[PDB]
Subunit: 102 residues, 4 copies
């Protein structure tokens, strides 16, 4: 009931309000990691694994498909274009080999 | 585009939403100063000034003025009751004087 | 090792730093309550109790009691000066009775 | 003597220091949050971009006829390691094809 309690407790609500905002801010910051794992997966991981499997199929003797995503504007596109140079080099060599048979 | 810009950029929306909540919290904290001035004026200043004015009126000879705030639970109630005792003492004094003057 | 983990986890430390600053901010905000209780008690409660106590002493018939804090510059000073007027009114009423009974 | 004339001012002013500390801590939180972007740019470049460009450069060398080019990053435990081991297999496969043709056309 006393003056000190009346005055001091009057700011308790406000402080909870401040804390509520801070908790929303903290939880939003906490979500960045899972979302970034997601982005990295779709943006980089998938394409890299795809390109790796493609390199492996080509090394194994499948030369029929142009390497996917050569059109991409970033370093994944650069990479994919380099693998296509490899595919074409292999394909010319195999074609010349086939011409030598018999 | 390059992958460093694509990935780094993907978190900018999140960071801005964190910042908005932080700014909101800081503004809410700043408002405590005003709110506390208001609470103090309501809880303390106004009743103390009301008692001071009442005291003055009694001292000037209105021995029947009503001393406000006597029922509050805090120290201001205690103060109001002590002012009511002064009023009573002055009434008793005046009634003794009138008897003497008879 | 996996690129999504490598990238996404690289920012966990920063995020925890941010969160730690938010905790420090919340903690410092909470401290305001106790500090405000203390301030209110020294600034307001103590002199209000001194005033009530003096008022009682005067009402109980010590018309010479010093009303404290008459020189204080804020509303406490206003109040104190009002109580001093009551005291002086009672002193006059006592002098007037003494004399009337002579 | 204290010049303060209003208890509402005295009480309210008394929490300003604390409040400014709260705000300063939140300013520093935001500043620390913003630094994330540039560190992330840097991690991506060091962890991903650099090895990818190296791998693409190495692929180009092999394709343009240096069948002995050393393929980097094959020991690496993530998906960059996987990609580098796939390009090392591709080299081995192109190398034998070229040699095969060379020998057949003698």
């Amino acid at each position: 009931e006393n003056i000190a309690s009346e005055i001091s407790k009057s700011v308790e609500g406000a402080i909870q309000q401040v804390k509520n905002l801070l908790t929303l801010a903290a939880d939003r910051a906490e979500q960045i990691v899972n979302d970034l794992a997601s982005t990295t997966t779709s943006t980089i991981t998938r394409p890299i694994i795809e390109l790796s499997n493609t390199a492996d199929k080509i090394a194994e003797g499948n030369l029929e498909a142009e390497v996917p995503h050569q059109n991409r504007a970033d370093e994944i596109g650069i990479l994919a274009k380099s693998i296509e140079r490899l595919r074409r080099s292999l394909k010319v060599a195999m074609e010349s080999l086939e011409e030598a048979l018999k």
